[PDB]
CSV table of C-alpha atoms and ligand atoms in Angstrom, one decimal:
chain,number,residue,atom,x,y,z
A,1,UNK,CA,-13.6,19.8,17.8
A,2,UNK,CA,-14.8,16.0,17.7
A,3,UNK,CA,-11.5,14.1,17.8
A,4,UNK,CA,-10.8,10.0,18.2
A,5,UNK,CA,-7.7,9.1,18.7
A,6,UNK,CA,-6.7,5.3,18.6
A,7,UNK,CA,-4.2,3.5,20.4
A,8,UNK,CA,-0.4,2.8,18.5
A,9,UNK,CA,0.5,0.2,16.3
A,10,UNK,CA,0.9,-3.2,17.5
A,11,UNK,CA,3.2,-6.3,16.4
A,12,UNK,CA,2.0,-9.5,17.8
A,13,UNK,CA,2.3,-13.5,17.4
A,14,UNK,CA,-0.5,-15.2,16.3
A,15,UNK,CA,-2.6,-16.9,19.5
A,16,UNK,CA,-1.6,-13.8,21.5
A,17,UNK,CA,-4.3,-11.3,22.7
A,18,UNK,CA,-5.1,-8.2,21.9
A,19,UNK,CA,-7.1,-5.1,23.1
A,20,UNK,CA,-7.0,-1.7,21.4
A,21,UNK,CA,-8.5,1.5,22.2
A,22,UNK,CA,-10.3,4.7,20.4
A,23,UNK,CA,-10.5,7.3,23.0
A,24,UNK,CA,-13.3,10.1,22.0
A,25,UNK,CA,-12.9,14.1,22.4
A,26,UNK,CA,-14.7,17.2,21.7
A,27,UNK,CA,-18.4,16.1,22.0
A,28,UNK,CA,-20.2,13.8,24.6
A,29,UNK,CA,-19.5,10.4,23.8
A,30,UNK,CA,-22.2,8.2,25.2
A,31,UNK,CA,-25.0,10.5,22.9
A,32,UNK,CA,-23.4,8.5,19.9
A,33,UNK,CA,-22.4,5.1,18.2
A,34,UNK,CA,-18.8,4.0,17.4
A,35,UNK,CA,-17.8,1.9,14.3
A,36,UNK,CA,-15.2,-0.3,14.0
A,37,UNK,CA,-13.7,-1.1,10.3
A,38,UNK,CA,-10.9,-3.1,9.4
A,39,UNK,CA,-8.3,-2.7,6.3
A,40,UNK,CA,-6.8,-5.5,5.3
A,41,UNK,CA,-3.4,-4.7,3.4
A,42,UNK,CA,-3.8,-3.6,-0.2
A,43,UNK,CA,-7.5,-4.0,0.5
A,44,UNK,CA,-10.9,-1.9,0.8
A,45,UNK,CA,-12.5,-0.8,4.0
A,46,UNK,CA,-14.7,-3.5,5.9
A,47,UNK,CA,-17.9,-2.8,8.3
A,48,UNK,CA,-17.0,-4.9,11.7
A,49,UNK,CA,-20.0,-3.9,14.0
A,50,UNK,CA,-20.7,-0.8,16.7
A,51,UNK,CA,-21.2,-0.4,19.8
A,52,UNK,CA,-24.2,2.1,21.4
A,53,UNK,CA,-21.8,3.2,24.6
A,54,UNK,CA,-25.2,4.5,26.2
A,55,UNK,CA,-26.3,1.0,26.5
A,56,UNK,CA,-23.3,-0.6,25.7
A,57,UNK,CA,-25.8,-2.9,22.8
A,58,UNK,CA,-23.1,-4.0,20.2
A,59,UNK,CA,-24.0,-5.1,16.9
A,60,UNK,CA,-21.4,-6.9,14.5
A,61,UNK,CA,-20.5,-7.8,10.7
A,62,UNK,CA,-21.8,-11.8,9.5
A,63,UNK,CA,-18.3,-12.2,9.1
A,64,UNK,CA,-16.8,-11.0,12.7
A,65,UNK,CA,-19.8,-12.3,14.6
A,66,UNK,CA,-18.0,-14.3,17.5
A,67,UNK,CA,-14.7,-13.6,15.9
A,68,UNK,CA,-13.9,-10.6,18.2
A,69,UNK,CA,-15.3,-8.1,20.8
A,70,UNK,CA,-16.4,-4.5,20.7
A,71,UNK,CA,-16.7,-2.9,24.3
A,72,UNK,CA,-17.1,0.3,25.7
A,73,UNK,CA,-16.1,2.6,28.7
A,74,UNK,CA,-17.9,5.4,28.6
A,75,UNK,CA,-17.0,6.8,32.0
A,76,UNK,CA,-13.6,7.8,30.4
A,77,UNK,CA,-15.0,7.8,26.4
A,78,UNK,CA,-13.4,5.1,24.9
A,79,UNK,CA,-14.6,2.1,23.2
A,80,UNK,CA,-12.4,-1.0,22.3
A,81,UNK,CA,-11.6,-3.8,20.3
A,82,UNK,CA,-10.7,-6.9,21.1
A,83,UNK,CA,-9.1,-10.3,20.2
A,84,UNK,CA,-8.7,-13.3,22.8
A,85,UNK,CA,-6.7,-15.5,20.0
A,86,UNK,CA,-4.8,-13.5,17.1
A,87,UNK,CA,-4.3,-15.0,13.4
A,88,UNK,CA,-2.0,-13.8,11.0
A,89,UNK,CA,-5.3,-13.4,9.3
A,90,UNK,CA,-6.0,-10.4,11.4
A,91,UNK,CA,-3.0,-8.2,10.3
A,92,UNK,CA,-5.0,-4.9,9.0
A,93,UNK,CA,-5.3,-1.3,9.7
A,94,UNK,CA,-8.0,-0.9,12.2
A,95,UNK,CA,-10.5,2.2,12.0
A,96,UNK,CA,-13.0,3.4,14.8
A,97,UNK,CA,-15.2,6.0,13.3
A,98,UNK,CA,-18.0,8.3,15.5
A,99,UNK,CA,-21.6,7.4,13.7
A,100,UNK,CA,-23.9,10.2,13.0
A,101,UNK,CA,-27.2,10.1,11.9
A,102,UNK,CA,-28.5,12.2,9.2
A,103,UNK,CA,-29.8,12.0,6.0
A,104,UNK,CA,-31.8,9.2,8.2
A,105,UNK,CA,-28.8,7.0,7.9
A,106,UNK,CA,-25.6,6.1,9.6
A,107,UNK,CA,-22.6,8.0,8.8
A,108,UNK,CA,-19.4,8.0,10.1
A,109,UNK,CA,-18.6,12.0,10.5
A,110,UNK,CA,-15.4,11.7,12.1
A,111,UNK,CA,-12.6,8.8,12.3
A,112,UNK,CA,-9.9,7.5,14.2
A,113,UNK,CA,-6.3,7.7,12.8
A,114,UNK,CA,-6.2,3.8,12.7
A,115,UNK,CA,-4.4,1.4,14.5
A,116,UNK,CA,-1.8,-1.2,12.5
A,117,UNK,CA,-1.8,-4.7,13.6
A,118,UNK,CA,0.5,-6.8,12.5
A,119,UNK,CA,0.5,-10.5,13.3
A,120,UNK,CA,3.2,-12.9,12.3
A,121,UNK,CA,5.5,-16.1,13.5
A,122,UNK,CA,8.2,-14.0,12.5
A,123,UNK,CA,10.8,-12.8,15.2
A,124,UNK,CA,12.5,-8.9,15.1
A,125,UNK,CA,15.0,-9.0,12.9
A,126,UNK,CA,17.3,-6.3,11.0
A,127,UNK,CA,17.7,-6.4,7.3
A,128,UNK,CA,20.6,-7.5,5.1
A,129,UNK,CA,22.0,-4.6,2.6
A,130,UNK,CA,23.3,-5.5,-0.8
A,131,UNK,CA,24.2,-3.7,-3.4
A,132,UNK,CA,22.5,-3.0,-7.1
A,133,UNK,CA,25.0,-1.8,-9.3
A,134,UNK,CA,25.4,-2.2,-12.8
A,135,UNK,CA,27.8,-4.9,-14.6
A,136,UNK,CA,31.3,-3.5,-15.4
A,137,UNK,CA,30.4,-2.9,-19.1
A,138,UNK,CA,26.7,-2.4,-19.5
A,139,UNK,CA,26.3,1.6,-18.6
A,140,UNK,CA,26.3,2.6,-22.0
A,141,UNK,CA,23.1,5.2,-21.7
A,142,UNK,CA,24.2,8.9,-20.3
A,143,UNK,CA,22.3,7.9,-17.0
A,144,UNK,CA,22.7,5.1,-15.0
A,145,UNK,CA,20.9,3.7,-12.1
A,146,UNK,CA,22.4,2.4,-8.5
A,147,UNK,CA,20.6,0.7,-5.4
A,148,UNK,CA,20.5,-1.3,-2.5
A,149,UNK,CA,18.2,-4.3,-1.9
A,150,UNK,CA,17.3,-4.7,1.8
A,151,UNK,CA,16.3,-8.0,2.9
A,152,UNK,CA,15.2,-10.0,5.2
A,153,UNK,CA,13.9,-8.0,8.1
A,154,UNK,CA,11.2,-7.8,10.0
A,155,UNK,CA,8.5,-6.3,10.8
A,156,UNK,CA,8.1,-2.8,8.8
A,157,UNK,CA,9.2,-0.5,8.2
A,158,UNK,CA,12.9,0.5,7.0
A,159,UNK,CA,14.0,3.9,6.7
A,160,UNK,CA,16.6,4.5,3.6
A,161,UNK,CA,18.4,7.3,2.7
A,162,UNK,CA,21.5,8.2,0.7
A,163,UNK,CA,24.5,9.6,0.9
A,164,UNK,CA,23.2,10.6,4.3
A,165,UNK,CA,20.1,12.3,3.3
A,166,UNK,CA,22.5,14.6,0.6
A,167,UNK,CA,21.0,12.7,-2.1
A,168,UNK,CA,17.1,13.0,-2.4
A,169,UNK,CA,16.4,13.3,-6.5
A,170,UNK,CA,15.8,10.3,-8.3
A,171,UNK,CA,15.5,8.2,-5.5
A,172,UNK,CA,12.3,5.5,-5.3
A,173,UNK,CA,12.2,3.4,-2.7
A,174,UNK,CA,9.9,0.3,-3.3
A,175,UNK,CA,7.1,-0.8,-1.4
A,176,UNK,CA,8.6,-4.0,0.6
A,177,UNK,CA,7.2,-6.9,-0.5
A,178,UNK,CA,6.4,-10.0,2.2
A,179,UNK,CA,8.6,-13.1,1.5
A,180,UNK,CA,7.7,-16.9,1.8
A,181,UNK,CA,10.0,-16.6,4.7
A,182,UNK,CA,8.0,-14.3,6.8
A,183,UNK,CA,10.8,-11.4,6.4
A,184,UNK,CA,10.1,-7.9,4.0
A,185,UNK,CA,12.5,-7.5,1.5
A,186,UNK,CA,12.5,-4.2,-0.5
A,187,UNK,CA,15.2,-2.0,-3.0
A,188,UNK,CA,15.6,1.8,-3.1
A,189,UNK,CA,17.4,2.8,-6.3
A,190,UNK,CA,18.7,6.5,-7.4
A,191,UNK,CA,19.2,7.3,-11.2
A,192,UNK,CA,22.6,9.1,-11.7
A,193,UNK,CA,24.7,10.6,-13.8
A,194,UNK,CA,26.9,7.4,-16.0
A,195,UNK,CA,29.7,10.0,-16.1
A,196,UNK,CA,29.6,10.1,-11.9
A,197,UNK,CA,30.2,6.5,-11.7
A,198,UNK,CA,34.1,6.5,-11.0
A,199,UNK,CA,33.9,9.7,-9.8
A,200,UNK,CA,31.4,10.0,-6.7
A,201,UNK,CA,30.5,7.7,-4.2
A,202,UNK,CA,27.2,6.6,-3.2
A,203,UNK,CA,25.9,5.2,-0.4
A,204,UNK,CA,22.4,4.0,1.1
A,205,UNK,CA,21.3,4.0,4.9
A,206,UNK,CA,19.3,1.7,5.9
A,207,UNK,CA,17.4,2.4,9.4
A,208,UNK,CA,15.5,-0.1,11.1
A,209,UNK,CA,14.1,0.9,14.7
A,210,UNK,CA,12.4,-2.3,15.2
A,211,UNK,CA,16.3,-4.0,15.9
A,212,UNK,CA,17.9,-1.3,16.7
A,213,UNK,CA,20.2,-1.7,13.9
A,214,UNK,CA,21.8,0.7,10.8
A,215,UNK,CA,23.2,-0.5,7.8
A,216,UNK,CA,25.3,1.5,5.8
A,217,UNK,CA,26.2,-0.1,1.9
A,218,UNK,CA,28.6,1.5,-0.4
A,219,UNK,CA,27.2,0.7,-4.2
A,220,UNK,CA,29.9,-1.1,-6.1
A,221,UNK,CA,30.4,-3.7,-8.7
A,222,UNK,CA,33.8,-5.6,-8.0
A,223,UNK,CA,36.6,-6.2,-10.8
A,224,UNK,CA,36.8,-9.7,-10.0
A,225,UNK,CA,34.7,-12.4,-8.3
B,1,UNK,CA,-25.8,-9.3,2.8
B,2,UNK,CA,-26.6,-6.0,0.5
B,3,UNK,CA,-22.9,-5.9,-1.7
B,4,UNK,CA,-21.8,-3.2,-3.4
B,5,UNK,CA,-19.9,-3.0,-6.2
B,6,UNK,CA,-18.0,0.2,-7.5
B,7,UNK,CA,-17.1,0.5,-11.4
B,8,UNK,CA,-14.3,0.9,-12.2
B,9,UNK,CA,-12.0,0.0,-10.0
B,10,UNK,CA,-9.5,2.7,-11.1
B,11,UNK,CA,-9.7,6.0,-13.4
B,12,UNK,CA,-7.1,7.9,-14.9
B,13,UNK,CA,-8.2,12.0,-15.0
B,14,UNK,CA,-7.0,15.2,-15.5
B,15,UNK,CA,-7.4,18.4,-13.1
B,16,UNK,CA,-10.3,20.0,-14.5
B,17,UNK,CA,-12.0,16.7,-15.7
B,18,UNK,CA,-15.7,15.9,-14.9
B,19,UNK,CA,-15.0,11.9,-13.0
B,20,UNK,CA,-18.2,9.7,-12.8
B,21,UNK,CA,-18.0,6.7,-10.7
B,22,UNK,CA,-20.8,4.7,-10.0
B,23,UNK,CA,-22.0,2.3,-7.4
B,24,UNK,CA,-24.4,-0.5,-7.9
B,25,UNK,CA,-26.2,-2.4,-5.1
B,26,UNK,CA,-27.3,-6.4,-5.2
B,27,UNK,CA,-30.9,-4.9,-3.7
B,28,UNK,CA,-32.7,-1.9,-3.2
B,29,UNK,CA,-31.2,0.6,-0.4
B,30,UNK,CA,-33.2,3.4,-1.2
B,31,UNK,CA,-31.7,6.8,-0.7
B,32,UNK,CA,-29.4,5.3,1.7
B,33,UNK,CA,-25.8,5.3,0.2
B,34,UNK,CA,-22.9,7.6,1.5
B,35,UNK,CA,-19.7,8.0,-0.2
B,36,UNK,CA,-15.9,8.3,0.9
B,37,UNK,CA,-12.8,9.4,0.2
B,38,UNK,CA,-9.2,8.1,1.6
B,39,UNK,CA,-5.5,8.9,1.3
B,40,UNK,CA,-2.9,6.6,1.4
B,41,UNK,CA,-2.2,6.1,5.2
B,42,UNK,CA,-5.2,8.1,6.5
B,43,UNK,CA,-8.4,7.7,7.4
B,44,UNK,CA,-11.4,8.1,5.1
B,45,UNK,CA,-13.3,11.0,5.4
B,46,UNK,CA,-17.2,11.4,4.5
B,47,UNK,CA,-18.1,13.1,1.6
B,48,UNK,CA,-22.0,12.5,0.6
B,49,UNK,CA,-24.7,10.7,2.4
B,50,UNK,CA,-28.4,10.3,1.8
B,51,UNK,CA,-27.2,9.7,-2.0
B,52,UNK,CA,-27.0,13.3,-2.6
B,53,UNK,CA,-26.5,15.5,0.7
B,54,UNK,CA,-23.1,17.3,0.9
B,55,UNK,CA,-21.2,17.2,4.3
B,56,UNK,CA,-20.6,20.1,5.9
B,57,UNK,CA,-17.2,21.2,5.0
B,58,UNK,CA,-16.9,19.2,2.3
B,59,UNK,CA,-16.5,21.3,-1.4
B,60,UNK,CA,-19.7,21.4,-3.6
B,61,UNK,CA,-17.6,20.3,-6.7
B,62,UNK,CA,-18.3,16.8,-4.9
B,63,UNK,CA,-22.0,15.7,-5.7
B,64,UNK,CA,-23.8,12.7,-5.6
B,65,UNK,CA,-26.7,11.2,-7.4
B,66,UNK,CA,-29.3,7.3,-7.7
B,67,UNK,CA,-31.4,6.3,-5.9
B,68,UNK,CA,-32.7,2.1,-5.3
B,69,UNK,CA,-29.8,0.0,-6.9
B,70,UNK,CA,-27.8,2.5,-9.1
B,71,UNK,CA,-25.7,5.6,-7.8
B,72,UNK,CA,-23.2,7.6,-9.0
B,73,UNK,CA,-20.5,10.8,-7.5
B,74,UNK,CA,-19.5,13.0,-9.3
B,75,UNK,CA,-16.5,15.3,-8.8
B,76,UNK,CA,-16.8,18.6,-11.6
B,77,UNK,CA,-13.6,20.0,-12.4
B,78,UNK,CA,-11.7,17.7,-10.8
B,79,UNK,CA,-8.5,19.0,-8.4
B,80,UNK,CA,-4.8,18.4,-7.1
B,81,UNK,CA,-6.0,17.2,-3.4
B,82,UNK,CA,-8.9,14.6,-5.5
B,83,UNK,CA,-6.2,11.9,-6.4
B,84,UNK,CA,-7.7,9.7,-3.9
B,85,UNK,CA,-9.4,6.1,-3.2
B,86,UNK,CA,-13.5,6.4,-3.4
B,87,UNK,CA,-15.6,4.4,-1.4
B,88,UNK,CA,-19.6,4.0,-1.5
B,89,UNK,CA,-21.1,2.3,1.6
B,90,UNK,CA,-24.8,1.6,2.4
B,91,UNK,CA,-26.7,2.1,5.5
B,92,UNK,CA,-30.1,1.2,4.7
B,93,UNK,CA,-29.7,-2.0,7.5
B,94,UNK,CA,-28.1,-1.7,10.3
B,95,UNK,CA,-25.3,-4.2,8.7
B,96,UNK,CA,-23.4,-1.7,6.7
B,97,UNK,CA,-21.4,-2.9,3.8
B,98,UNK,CA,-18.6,-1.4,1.6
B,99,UNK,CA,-17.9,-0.8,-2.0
B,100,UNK,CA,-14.4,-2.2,-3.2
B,101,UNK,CA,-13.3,1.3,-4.3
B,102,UNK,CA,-12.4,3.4,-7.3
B,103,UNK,CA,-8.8,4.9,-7.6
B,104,UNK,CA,-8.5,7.8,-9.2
B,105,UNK,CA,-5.0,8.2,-10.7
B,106,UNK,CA,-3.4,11.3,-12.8
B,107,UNK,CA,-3.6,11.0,-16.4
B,108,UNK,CA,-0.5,11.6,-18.5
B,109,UNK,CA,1.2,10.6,-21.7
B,110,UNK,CA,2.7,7.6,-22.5
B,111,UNK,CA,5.8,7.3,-21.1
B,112,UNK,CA,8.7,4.3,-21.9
B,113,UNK,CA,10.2,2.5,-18.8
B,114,UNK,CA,14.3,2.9,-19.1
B,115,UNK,CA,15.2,-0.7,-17.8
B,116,UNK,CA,17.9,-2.1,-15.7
B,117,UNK,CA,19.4,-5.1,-14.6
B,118,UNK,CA,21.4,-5.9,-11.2
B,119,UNK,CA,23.0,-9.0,-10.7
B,120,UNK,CA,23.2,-10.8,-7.5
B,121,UNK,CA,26.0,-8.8,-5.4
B,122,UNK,CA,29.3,-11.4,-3.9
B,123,UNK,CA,28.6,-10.7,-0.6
B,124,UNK,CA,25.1,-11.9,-0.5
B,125,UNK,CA,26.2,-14.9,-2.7
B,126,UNK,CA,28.6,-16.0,0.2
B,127,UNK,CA,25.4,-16.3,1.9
B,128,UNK,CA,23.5,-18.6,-0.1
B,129,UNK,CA,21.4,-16.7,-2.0
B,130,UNK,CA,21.2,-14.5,-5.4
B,131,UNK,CA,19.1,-11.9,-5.8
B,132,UNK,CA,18.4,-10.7,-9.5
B,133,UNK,CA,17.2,-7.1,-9.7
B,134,UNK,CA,15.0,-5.5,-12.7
B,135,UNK,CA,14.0,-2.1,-12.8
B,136,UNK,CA,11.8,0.1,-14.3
B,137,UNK,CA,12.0,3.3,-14.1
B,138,UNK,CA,9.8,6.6,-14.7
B,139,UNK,CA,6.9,4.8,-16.9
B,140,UNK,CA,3.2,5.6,-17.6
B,141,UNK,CA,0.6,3.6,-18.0
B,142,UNK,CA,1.3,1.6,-14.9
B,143,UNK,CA,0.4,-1.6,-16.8
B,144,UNK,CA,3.5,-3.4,-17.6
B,145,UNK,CA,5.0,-6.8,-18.3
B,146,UNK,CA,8.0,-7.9,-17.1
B,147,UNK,CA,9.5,-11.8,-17.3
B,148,UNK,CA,12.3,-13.3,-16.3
B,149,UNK,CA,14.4,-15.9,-18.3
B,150,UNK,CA,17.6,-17.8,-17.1
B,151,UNK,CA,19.5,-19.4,-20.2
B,152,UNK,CA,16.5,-18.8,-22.5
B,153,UNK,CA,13.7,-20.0,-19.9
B,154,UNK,CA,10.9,-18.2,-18.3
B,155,UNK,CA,10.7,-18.5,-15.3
B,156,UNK,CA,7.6,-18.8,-12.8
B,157,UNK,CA,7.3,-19.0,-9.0
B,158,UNK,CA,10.6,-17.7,-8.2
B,159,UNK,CA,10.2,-13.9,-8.7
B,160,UNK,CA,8.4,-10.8,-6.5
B,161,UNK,CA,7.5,-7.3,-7.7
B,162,UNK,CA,6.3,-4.2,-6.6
B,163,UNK,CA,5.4,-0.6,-7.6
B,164,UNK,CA,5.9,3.0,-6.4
B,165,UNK,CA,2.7,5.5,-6.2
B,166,UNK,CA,2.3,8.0,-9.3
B,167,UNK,CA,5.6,10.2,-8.8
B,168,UNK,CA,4.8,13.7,-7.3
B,169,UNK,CA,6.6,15.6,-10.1
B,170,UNK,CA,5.9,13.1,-13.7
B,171,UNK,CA,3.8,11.1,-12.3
B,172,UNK,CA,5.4,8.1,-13.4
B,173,UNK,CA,5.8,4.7,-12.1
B,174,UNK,CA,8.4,2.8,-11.3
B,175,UNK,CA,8.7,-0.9,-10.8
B,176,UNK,CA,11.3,-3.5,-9.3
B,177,UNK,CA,11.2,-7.1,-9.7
B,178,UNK,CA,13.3,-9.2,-8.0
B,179,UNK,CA,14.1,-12.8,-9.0
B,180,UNK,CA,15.8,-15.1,-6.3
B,181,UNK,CA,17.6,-18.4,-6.3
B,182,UNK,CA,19.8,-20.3,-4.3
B,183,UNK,CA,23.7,-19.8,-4.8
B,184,UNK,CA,24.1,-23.0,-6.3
B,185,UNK,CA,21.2,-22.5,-8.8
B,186,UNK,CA,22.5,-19.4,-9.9
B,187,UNK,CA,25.8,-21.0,-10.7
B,188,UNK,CA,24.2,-23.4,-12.8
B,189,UNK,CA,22.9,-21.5,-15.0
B,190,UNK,CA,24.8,-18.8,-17.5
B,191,UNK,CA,22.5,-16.2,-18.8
B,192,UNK,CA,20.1,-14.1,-17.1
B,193,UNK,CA,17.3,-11.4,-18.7
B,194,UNK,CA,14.3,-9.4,-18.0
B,195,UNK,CA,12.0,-9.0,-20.6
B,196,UNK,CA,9.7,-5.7,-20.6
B,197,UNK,CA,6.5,-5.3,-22.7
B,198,UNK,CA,5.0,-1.8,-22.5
B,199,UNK,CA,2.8,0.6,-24.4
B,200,UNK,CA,5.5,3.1,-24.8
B,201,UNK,CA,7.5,0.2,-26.1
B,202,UNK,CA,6.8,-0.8,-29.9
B,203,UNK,CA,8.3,-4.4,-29.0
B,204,UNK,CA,9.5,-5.6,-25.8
B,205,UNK,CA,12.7,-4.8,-24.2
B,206,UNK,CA,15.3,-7.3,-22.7
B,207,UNK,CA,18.2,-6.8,-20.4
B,208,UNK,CA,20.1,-9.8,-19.4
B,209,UNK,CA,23.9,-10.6,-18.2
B,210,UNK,CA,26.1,-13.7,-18.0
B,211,UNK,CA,27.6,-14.9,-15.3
B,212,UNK,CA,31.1,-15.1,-15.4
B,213,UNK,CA,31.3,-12.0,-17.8
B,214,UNK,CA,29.6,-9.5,-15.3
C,1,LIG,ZN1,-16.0,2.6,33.8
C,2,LIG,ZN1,33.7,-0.8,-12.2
C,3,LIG,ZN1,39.5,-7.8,-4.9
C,4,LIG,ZN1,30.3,-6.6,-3.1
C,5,LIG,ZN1,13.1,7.3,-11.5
C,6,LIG,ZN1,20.7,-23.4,-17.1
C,7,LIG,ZN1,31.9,-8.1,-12.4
């Protein structure tokens, strides 16, 4: 079956270079046209150009004319995007689909899994853990909610868990949002039982591969301060 | 330069629902418009091209119709796997261009955020820094308010939020906003609240602590 398959996620600094790669399986890849489409975060899908491997003619977007390179090497089926200065700007997922005529138009039929690209200033950095728990006397309801806010880390993503993967119901964890600093912050909360409050511990663990690091947070409020 | 634009951006439905989204074009593009659908985190796939031919694979509850400027898809009976982003794009140039997209959410019944207020925890306040936590939990629509006052002021600037996807068993949302100051801001300052406005509310609803009696 026609498969592309893209080339991992990539973290970089802004004036770094960058090449990535969509590598093309399953049908003969210099008899069609590969697309490249970016995807900004939170955004829609945007046309970037193609390249014709068979001739290696490329073709690009207004908007990404000059601004990067589309290349091909056919004898080992991959085509390839390219950067020679990164901006933070550029921090998208990026798509390469297989075109396919029909209908007497271009379609893209089949699509690469994407490649993130994330560029930033910031440096690796593990997150913070602090707990969300209630003031002494405000649980008044029959169900109370508990978290941890995990901040300051970079780049994505976190794993959390709690009460080491015990606890699974209730639990939202929040899409981390990016701070003024450069560095994610995000929360993961559980709603429990008010009655469990004295009674059972609980406890969120935060992974972050990116450092290396593991955070484990009890959830308490303090008597005193 | 041919721009598409999708309407509307974003749909509630139910399974079983006819959904109509359309796609308008700033000039003619003929026949040439092909629609597509993406999940969170994956690729799109292609569902119509030629304004009305069906991909192969692709189920015939998915149909498309226009021609020109105006175009529209059409999913009948609507199922689970069809909570999804849409996407037009036309090809009648070689310079392809993009729709903005149409998410189509699950419809449900009003639902009431339960709210909930964190203050900043001592060990990040030794730090220099106090984050203030508001919560909403388990609510539908997904439009909400939420403010934050410190002694009796909204405040601007200073706060972040976010929200969770449509929850896989209520589909509820949830939300989190977080408000942050330095240490020696907070301490100024004696009373802090989170005001919530939803539908499900009949007037808004405001948590708040003081500091020093927390
Ligand atoms: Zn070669
Ligand atoms: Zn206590
Ligand atoms: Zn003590
Ligand atoms: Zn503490
Ligand atoms: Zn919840
Ligand atoms: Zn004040
Ligand atoms: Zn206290």
């Amino acid at each position: 079956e026609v498969q592309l398959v893209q080339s991992g996620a990539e973290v970089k600094k802004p004036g770094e270079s960058l090449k990535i790669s969509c590598k093309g399986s399953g049908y003969s890849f210099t008899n069609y046209w590969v697309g490249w489409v970016r995807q900004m975060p939170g955004k829609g899908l945007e046309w970037m150009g193609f390249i014709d491997p068979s001739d290696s003619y490329t073709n690009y977007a207004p908007s990404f004319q000059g601004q990067v390179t589309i290349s091909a090497d056919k004898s080992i089926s991959t085509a390839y995007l390219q950067w020679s200065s990164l901006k933070a700007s550029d921090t998208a997922m990026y798509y390469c689909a297989r075109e396919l005529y029909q209908g007497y138009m271009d379609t893209f039929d089949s699509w690469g899994q994407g490649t993130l690209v994330t560029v930033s200033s910031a440096s690796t950095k593990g997150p913070s853990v602090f707990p969300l728990a209630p003031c002494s006397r405000s649980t008044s309801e029959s169900t109370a909610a508990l978290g941890c806010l995990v901040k300051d880390y970079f780049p994505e993503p976190v794993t959390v868990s709690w009460n080491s993967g015990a606890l699974t119901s209730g639990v939202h964890t929040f899409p981390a949002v990016l701070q003024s600093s450069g560095l994610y912050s995000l929360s993961s909360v559980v709603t429990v039982p008010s009655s469990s409050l004295g009674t059972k511990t609980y406890t969120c663990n935060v992974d972050h591969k990116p450092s290396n690091t593991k955070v484990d947070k009890r959830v308490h409020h303090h008597h005193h301060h | 330069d041919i721009q598409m634009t999708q309407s509307p951006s974003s749909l509630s439905a139910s399974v079983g629902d006819r959904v109509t989204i359309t796609c308008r074009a700033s000039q003619s593009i003929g026949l040439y418009l092909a629609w597509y659908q993406q999940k969170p985190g994956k690729a799109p796939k292609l569902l119509i091209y030629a304004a009305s031919s069906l991909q192969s694979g692709v189920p015939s509850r998915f149909s498309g119709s226009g021609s020109g400027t105006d175009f529209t898809l059409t999913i009948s009976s609507l199922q689970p796997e069809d909570f999804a982003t849409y996407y037009c794009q036309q090809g009648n140039t070689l310079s392809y261009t993009f729709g903005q997209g149409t998410k189509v959410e699950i419809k449900r019944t009003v639902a009431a955020p339960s709210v909930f207020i964190f203050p900043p925890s001592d060990e990040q306040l030794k730090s220099g820094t106090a984050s203030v936590v508001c919560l909403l939990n388990n609510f539908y629509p997904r439009e909400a308010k939420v403010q934050w006052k410190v002694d009796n002021a909204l405040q601007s600037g200073n706060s972040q939020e976010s929200v969770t996807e449509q929850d896989s068993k209520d589909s509820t949302y949830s939300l989190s906003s977080t408000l942050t100051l330095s240490k020696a801001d907070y301490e100024k300052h004696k009373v802090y609240a989170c005001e919530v406005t939803h539908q499900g509310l009949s007037s808004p609803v405001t948590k708040s602590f003081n500091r020093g009696e927390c």
